[PDB]
Amino acid sequence: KAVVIDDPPLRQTPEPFDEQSAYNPQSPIAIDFGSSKLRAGFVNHATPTHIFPNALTKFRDRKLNKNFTFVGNDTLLDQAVRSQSRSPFDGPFVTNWNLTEEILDYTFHHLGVVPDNGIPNPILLTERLATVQSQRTNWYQILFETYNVPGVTFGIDSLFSFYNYNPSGNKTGLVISCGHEDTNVIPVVDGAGILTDAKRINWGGHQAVDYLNDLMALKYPYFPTKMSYLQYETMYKDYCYVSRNYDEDIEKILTLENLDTNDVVVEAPFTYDWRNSILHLFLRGPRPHDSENIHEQHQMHLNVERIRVPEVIFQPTMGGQDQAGICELSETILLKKFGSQPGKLSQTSIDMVNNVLITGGNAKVPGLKERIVKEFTGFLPTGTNITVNMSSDPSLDAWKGMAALARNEEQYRKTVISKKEYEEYGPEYIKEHKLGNTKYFE
Amino acid sequence: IYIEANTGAVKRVGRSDAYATEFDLETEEYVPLPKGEVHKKKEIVQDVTLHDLDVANARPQGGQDV
């Protein structure tokens, strides 16, 4: 079995921009202010028209006024402007609001909407769970008096995903989102997301790539070249999966018969028996080390512990966050809440078990589904049927939630806030519709 | 544990594997979780003789069960 090298490079997009001049001045705009990927489009189309990495650069060019090539895949057109590109969206929520105004101005150019006053269409907004009130007042300002929108509603994107795959709007189910930055589990009763009962995990996927960067830097402190963070996401999306059970795998993960198929080695770009030594197997894998070869100094022997970086979702204690994992949150929700006791499930809990939806940008990792169903049947009573659902693209389904609420008109009128209600009630006002945030108090 | 429904024997196998890191060192024998169903039912046949019965219920000193 000869060693194969793996290259870590990402090429550039030669065709960044496209738009259509014709538009409907009555059809609203569906938007998704995603951390990893901004998604845009109309109402009538089933899939989102514009997907963009939600990033901008202020490219400075001498003799031509130093303000060029702001938002989109044109940042991915050159590696230099890709490196200087600044996503404004911070940990909780975005820091730089006029940067967001640049993004909204760019996409309003890219729907081809000819401007009538500020904006002649309703705007369909996505919003993270349990938003800080100052953040929503800034949202109210930037929408209503900066862009003159007739109507804006905002809610939790995974709740819209839950509505999208169960469009009756009154089903009982459990939704577990794994987003870019945080991940959370929300219980839903009768189509209403009970937000007193939900719990949120401060890990996401940003900290997963950060963890992979830190482990790969500490494993090889004397690595010659430095490896880019985009290459870290390439390495994370390519070679990572979730164990069926973590506890018995890690004893077997450095056994010699395992390393033949487990270990895949990455090549960084450039231009005392070993069977007894477990450091040799950890650092250099199943082939003997060639200490003179310039390939081996640039060889990144990962997949010795490829399981460890996805597994920290189920156990955030390796991530440093003292929060219970997804399994314990499911135990508390399904066996201690909504009238269910250990040994006697209430009917709402059984209906929640019957419909479990997982979604988000971090669900693209293989092996999550079988681990989730096995962990669920670990603690549920025997005979309780468990049905867990996956998307083709779990990240793209919040936009279909936008399209679904845009279709359902009698539900759409309940969610939509108006300019008149905003000016009458002030920015400290949120409609307590079921598919969105609730009041801070009763 | 071990519980037989008919006889009523209670046998303690040991503490669970998920409770192994509460302390770094303690006397509790940590056995893993059983991989099968909790409830297992099977039928057997008991071949006894008459003499097994007569020495069962004629003990000069009792306590054959313990």
Next chain:
Amino acid sequence: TRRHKSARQLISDENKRINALLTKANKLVPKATYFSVEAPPSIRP
């Protein structure tokens, strides 16, 4: 006027606002805040 305010500072003065509201309320359990929806620590070792 628009300056970059720290996300940690945003969590800080959100906490201050709920603390102010609760201290003027009691002298009213919060239904759903950013702190209350944070997951608790695990109970198993």
